[PDB]
């Protein structure tokens, strides 16, 4: 019934990658290219993309919903332009998760102008567990995650109506 | 292994996902490995995943 959205990896902390170039005409905001706000599309810096190794320990008492993604580019040339490294992965581990993602190149129809694709993943990180990310490219990294602070009866109701100001 | 019995057989096997490249070499020498398994219906090819994981 309620999150508290918390910052788990500051966008300002990416000292070896570009963190503010991951924007797209597919995601416009107020006339400018933008992107999903809660994750960060990391881009190589000075023609290099050093291997990322970052961890976050859930020091709260509440479970945490963590979201991240991978970018599947259009061709090899785009792969190099964005990430330098031609052959890349993102590995993710917790006490239960054991994931190792690899970008897929395919030739795809444009949707919202883009033939590339972003694929998102999630996990629930229990109190006192940690999540460990490793990648040498294509990583759409967490910035914000959601602490679950209230649980209870709820439902997702499908309706075209909007608020009625009543009880 | 050929099942020469009249009864179905439940067969179990596994793969180890190590912690890092160094452990991979220490245990198995070969850096890049697989396990392939086939029967009349199974067509499997497993690959170890390195990730950095919490101790359990
Ligand atoms: C996440 O952080 C906590 C530390 O705040 C870790 O829990 C501690 O583990 C150490 C052993 O190295 C103990 O001495 C402390 O008593 C533990 N504290 C608590 C609150 O349990 C925890 O191991 C970390 N999680 C992971 C998976 O690394």
CSV table of C-alpha atoms and ligand atoms in Angstrom, one decimal:
chain,number,residue,atom,x,y,z
A,1,UNK,CA,0.0,0.0,0.0
A,2,UNK,CA,3.1,2.3,0.2
A,3,UNK,CA,6.7,2.8,-1.0
A,4,UNK,CA,9.4,5.1,0.2
A,5,UNK,CA,11.6,5.7,-2.9
A,6,UNK,CA,15.2,5.8,-1.8
A,7,UNK,CA,18.4,6.6,-3.6
A,8,UNK,CA,20.7,3.5,-3.6
A,9,UNK,CA,23.4,4.5,-6.1
A,10,UNK,CA,23.9,8.3,-6.6
A,11,UNK,CA,24.0,9.4,-10.3
A,12,UNK,CA,26.9,11.6,-9.2
A,13,UNK,CA,29.0,8.6,-8.2
A,14,UNK,CA,29.9,7.3,-11.6
A,15,UNK,CA,33.4,8.7,-11.8
A,16,UNK,CA,34.6,6.5,-14.6
A,17,UNK,CA,31.6,6.5,-17.0
A,18,UNK,CA,29.3,9.1,-18.4
A,19,UNK,CA,26.1,9.3,-16.5
A,20,UNK,CA,24.3,12.2,-18.2
A,21,UNK,CA,24.5,11.2,-21.8
A,22,UNK,CA,22.0,8.4,-21.7
A,23,UNK,CA,19.0,10.2,-23.2
A,24,UNK,CA,16.8,9.6,-26.2
A,25,UNK,CA,14.2,11.3,-28.5
A,26,UNK,CA,12.0,8.2,-27.6
A,27,UNK,CA,11.7,9.7,-24.1
A,28,UNK,CA,11.0,13.4,-24.6
A,29,UNK,CA,10.4,15.8,-21.7
A,30,UNK,CA,9.5,19.5,-22.2
A,31,UNK,CA,11.0,19.4,-25.7
A,32,UNK,CA,14.3,17.7,-24.8
A,33,UNK,CA,15.6,14.1,-25.0
A,34,UNK,CA,15.3,12.4,-21.6
A,35,UNK,CA,15.0,8.9,-20.1
A,36,UNK,CA,13.5,6.8,-17.4
A,37,UNK,CA,14.2,8.7,-14.2
A,38,UNK,CA,14.9,5.9,-11.7
A,39,UNK,CA,17.6,4.2,-13.7
A,40,UNK,CA,20.7,5.5,-15.4
A,41,UNK,CA,21.8,4.7,-19.0
A,42,UNK,CA,25.6,4.7,-18.5
A,43,UNK,CA,27.8,5.6,-21.5
A,44,UNK,CA,31.5,5.1,-22.1
A,45,UNK,CA,33.8,8.0,-21.1
A,46,UNK,CA,36.9,9.1,-23.1
A,47,UNK,CA,36.5,6.1,-25.4
A,48,UNK,CA,36.7,3.7,-22.4
A,49,UNK,CA,34.2,1.7,-20.3
A,50,UNK,CA,36.0,0.3,-17.3
A,51,UNK,CA,34.4,-2.8,-15.6
A,52,UNK,CA,31.8,-1.7,-13.1
A,53,UNK,CA,31.6,-3.4,-9.7
A,54,UNK,CA,29.1,-1.9,-7.3
A,55,UNK,CA,27.2,-3.2,-4.4
A,56,UNK,CA,24.4,-2.1,-2.2
A,57,UNK,CA,23.5,-3.5,1.2
A,58,UNK,CA,19.9,-3.3,2.4
A,59,UNK,CA,20.5,-1.8,5.8
A,60,UNK,CA,16.8,-1.2,6.3
A,61,UNK,CA,14.2,-3.4,8.1
A,62,UNK,CA,12.0,-3.4,5.0
A,63,UNK,CA,12.2,-5.4,1.8
A,64,UNK,CA,13.5,-3.3,-1.2
A,65,UNK,CA,12.2,-3.5,-4.8
A,66,UNK,CA,15.3,-3.0,-7.0
A,67,UNK,CA,15.1,-2.3,-10.8
A,68,UNK,CA,17.8,-2.4,-13.5
A,69,UNK,CA,18.1,-3.0,-17.2
A,70,UNK,CA,20.1,-3.9,-20.2
A,71,UNK,CA,20.3,-2.2,-23.6
A,72,UNK,CA,20.1,-4.3,-26.7
A,73,UNK,CA,21.6,-2.3,-29.5
A,74,UNK,CA,21.0,-2.3,-33.3
A,75,UNK,CA,24.3,-3.4,-34.6
A,76,UNK,CA,28.0,-3.7,-33.8
A,77,UNK,CA,28.9,-0.1,-34.7
A,78,UNK,CA,26.4,1.3,-32.2
A,79,UNK,CA,27.7,-1.1,-29.6
A,80,UNK,CA,31.2,0.4,-30.0
A,81,UNK,CA,30.0,3.9,-30.2
A,82,UNK,CA,28.1,3.6,-26.8
A,83,UNK,CA,30.2,1.2,-24.9
A,84,UNK,CA,33.5,0.7,-26.6
A,85,UNK,CA,33.7,-3.0,-25.6
A,86,UNK,CA,32.3,-5.3,-28.3
A,87,UNK,CA,31.4,-8.2,-26.0
A,88,UNK,CA,29.6,-7.4,-22.8
A,89,UNK,CA,27.7,-8.7,-19.9
A,90,UNK,CA,25.9,-7.6,-16.7
A,91,UNK,CA,26.1,-10.0,-13.8
A,92,UNK,CA,23.8,-9.6,-10.8
A,93,UNK,CA,23.9,-11.6,-7.5
A,94,UNK,CA,22.2,-11.5,-4.1
A,95,UNK,CA,21.6,-14.4,-1.6
A,96,UNK,CA,19.2,-15.9,-4.2
A,97,UNK,CA,19.7,-14.2,-7.5
A,98,UNK,CA,22.4,-15.5,-9.9
A,99,UNK,CA,21.9,-13.6,-13.1
A,100,UNK,CA,24.2,-13.0,-16.1
A,101,UNK,CA,22.7,-10.9,-18.9
A,102,UNK,CA,24.1,-10.5,-22.4
A,103,UNK,CA,23.0,-8.0,-25.0
A,104,UNK,CA,21.3,-9.3,-28.0
A,105,UNK,CA,21.8,-7.8,-31.3
A,106,UNK,CA,18.8,-8.1,-33.7
A,107,UNK,CA,17.5,-6.0,-36.5
A,108,UNK,CA,14.3,-4.6,-35.3
A,109,UNK,CA,11.4,-2.5,-36.4
A,110,UNK,CA,11.5,1.1,-35.1
A,111,UNK,CA,9.1,1.7,-32.2
A,112,UNK,CA,9.0,5.3,-30.8
A,113,UNK,CA,11.8,6.0,-33.3
A,114,UNK,CA,14.1,3.3,-32.0
A,115,UNK,CA,15.2,-0.1,-33.2
A,116,UNK,CA,17.2,-0.7,-30.0
A,117,UNK,CA,15.5,-2.2,-27.0
A,118,UNK,CA,15.8,-1.8,-23.2
A,119,UNK,CA,14.9,-4.9,-21.1
A,120,UNK,CA,14.3,-4.4,-17.4
A,121,UNK,CA,14.6,-6.7,-14.5
A,122,UNK,CA,13.7,-6.6,-10.8
A,123,UNK,CA,14.2,-8.3,-7.5
A,124,UNK,CA,13.2,-8.0,-3.9
A,125,UNK,CA,16.3,-7.4,-1.7
A,126,UNK,CA,15.6,-8.7,1.8
A,127,UNK,CA,16.8,-6.8,4.9
A,128,UNK,CA,20.5,-7.3,5.5
A,129,UNK,CA,21.1,-8.8,2.1
A,130,UNK,CA,23.2,-7.2,-0.6
A,131,UNK,CA,23.0,-6.9,-4.4
A,132,UNK,CA,26.2,-6.9,-6.5
A,133,UNK,CA,26.3,-5.6,-10.0
A,134,UNK,CA,29.2,-6.2,-12.5
A,135,UNK,CA,29.2,-5.0,-16.1
A,136,UNK,CA,31.6,-3.9,-18.9
A,137,UNK,CA,28.7,-2.4,-20.9
A,138,UNK,CA,25.0,-2.0,-21.8
A,139,UNK,CA,24.1,-1.6,-18.1
A,140,UNK,CA,21.0,0.5,-17.2
A,141,UNK,CA,22.0,1.0,-13.5
A,142,UNK,CA,19.7,1.6,-10.5
A,143,UNK,CA,19.5,5.1,-9.1
A,144,UNK,CA,16.3,4.8,-7.0
A,145,UNK,CA,14.7,1.7,-5.5
A,146,UNK,CA,11.5,1.3,-3.6
A,147,UNK,CA,11.4,0.4,0.1
A,148,UNK,CA,8.2,-1.4,1.0
A,149,UNK,CA,6.9,0.3,4.0
A,150,UNK,CA,3.2,-0.7,4.2
A,151,UNK,CA,1.7,-4.0,3.1
A,152,UNK,CA,-2.0,-4.8,3.1
A,153,UNK,CA,-5.0,-5.5,0.9
A,154,UNK,CA,-4.8,-3.8,-2.4
A,155,UNK,CA,-5.6,-4.5,-6.1
A,156,UNK,CA,-4.8,-3.1,-9.4
A,157,UNK,CA,-8.2,-2.1,-10.8
A,158,UNK,CA,-8.6,-1.7,-14.5
A,159,UNK,CA,-10.8,1.4,-15.2
A,160,UNK,CA,-10.9,4.4,-17.6
A,161,UNK,CA,-12.5,6.6,-14.9
A,162,UNK,CA,-10.6,9.1,-12.8
A,163,UNK,CA,-10.9,10.5,-9.3
A,164,UNK,CA,-14.3,11.3,-8.1
A,165,UNK,CA,-13.5,13.2,-4.9
A,166,UNK,CA,-15.7,10.9,-2.7
A,167,UNK,CA,-15.5,8.2,-0.1
B,1,UNK,CA,24.5,-44.4,-19.4
B,2,UNK,CA,21.9,-46.7,-21.1
B,3,UNK,CA,18.8,-47.5,-19.1
B,4,UNK,CA,18.7,-51.3,-19.4
B,5,UNK,CA,15.9,-51.6,-16.9
B,6,UNK,CA,12.2,-51.8,-17.6
B,7,UNK,CA,11.5,-48.9,-15.2
B,8,UNK,CA,11.8,-45.2,-15.8
B,9,UNK,CA,14.9,-43.7,-14.0
B,10,UNK,CA,15.1,-40.3,-12.3
B,11,UNK,CA,18.6,-38.9,-13.0
B,12,UNK,CA,20.1,-35.9,-11.2
B,13,UNK,CA,23.2,-33.8,-12.0
B,14,UNK,CA,24.4,-30.3,-11.4
B,15,UNK,CA,26.6,-27.4,-12.3
B,16,UNK,CA,28.8,-25.3,-10.1
B,17,UNK,CA,28.7,-21.5,-10.5
B,18,UNK,CA,31.9,-20.1,-9.0
B,19,UNK,CA,32.7,-16.7,-7.5
B,20,UNK,CA,35.4,-15.4,-9.8
B,21,UNK,CA,37.8,-16.3,-12.6
B,22,UNK,CA,40.6,-17.3,-10.2
B,23,UNK,CA,38.4,-19.9,-8.4
B,24,UNK,CA,37.4,-21.2,-11.9
B,25,UNK,CA,41.0,-21.9,-12.7
B,26,UNK,CA,41.8,-23.3,-9.3
B,27,UNK,CA,39.1,-25.9,-9.5
B,28,UNK,CA,38.8,-26.7,-13.2
B,29,UNK,CA,41.8,-25.2,-15.0
B,30,UNK,CA,39.8,-24.4,-18.1
B,31,UNK,CA,38.5,-20.8,-18.1
B,32,UNK,CA,35.5,-21.3,-20.4
B,33,UNK,CA,33.4,-24.4,-19.8
B,34,UNK,CA,30.1,-26.2,-20.5
B,35,UNK,CA,28.1,-29.3,-19.7
B,36,UNK,CA,26.1,-30.7,-22.5
B,37,UNK,CA,23.4,-33.3,-21.8
B,38,UNK,CA,21.3,-35.3,-24.3
B,39,UNK,CA,18.8,-38.1,-24.4
B,40,UNK,CA,16.0,-38.9,-26.9
B,41,UNK,CA,14.3,-35.7,-25.7
B,42,UNK,CA,16.7,-33.7,-23.7
B,43,UNK,CA,19.0,-31.2,-25.5
B,44,UNK,CA,20.7,-29.2,-22.8
B,45,UNK,CA,23.9,-27.1,-22.8
B,46,UNK,CA,24.7,-25.4,-19.4
B,47,UNK,CA,27.3,-22.7,-18.9
B,48,UNK,CA,28.6,-21.6,-15.5
B,49,UNK,CA,27.6,-18.1,-14.5
B,50,UNK,CA,30.0,-16.0,-12.6
B,51,UNK,CA,28.3,-13.4,-10.3
B,52,UNK,CA,29.3,-11.8,-7.0
B,53,UNK,CA,27.0,-13.2,-4.5
B,54,UNK,CA,26.1,-13.0,-0.8
B,55,UNK,CA,27.5,-15.8,1.3
B,56,UNK,CA,25.0,-18.4,2.2
C,1,LIG,C1,25.0,-6.1,5.0
C,1,LIG,O1,25.5,-5.3,6.1
C,1,LIG,C2,25.5,-5.8,7.4
C,1,LIG,C3,26.4,-4.9,8.2
C,1,LIG,O2,25.6,-3.8,8.7
C,1,LIG,C4,26.1,-7.2,7.5
C,1,LIG,O3,25.7,-7.9,8.7
C,1,LIG,C5,26.8,-8.0,9.6
C,1,LIG,O4,27.7,-9.0,9.4
C,1,LIG,C6,28.8,-9.0,10.2
C,1,LIG,C7,29.8,-10.1,9.8
C,1,LIG,O5,30.7,-9.6,8.9
C,1,LIG,C8,28.5,-9.0,11.7
C,1,LIG,O6,29.6,-8.8,12.4
C,1,LIG,C9,27.4,-8.1,12.0
C,1,LIG,O7,26.8,-8.4,13.3
C,1,LIG,C10,26.2,-8.1,11.0
C,1,LIG,N1,25.2,-7.1,11.3
C,1,LIG,C11,23.9,-7.4,11.2
C,1,LIG,C12,22.9,-6.3,11.4
C,1,LIG,O8,23.5,-8.5,10.9
C,1,LIG,C13,25.6,-8.1,6.3
C,1,LIG,O9,26.4,-9.3,6.3
C,1,LIG,C14,25.7,-7.4,5.0
C,1,LIG,N2,25.2,-8.3,4.0
C,1,LIG,C15,25.9,-9.0,3.1
C,1,LIG,C16,25.2,-10.1,2.3
C,1,LIG,O10,27.1,-8.7,2.9
